[PDB]
Amino acid sequence: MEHVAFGSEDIENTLAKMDDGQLDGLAFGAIQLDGDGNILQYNAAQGDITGRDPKQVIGKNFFKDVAPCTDSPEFYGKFKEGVASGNLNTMFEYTFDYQMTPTKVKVHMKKALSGDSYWVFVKRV
């Protein structure tokens, strides 16, 4: 188990050292997106929450293909403003309900340290 707490102030520095195997040891769901919303990384805890198979969703677009319930001003709209501005750090509750039992989660979106990548972190509430 990797010990990093959800919501930690310097989480992007800590997660910069992990490969996909290490990300699978986190206590919470983690998705890495490019600035178009394509999925680059998707960990085991996220798949436990959503039912998706991690290897199968890498390369898909999160907003168009995987998670249409997030294509809303309340989720996608926040992401796209962050990508446009080059800064993003926001936490909110949301319900995931596409092809699954409706599940309430806490979401933390934060710009990654390097380049044009963005984290989505998720835990149950």
Ligand SMILES: *C(=O)/C=C/c1ccc(O)cc1
């Ligand atoms: C709504 O369509 C949410 C879907 C969803 C959220 C997060 C995931 O990792 C996968 C699907």
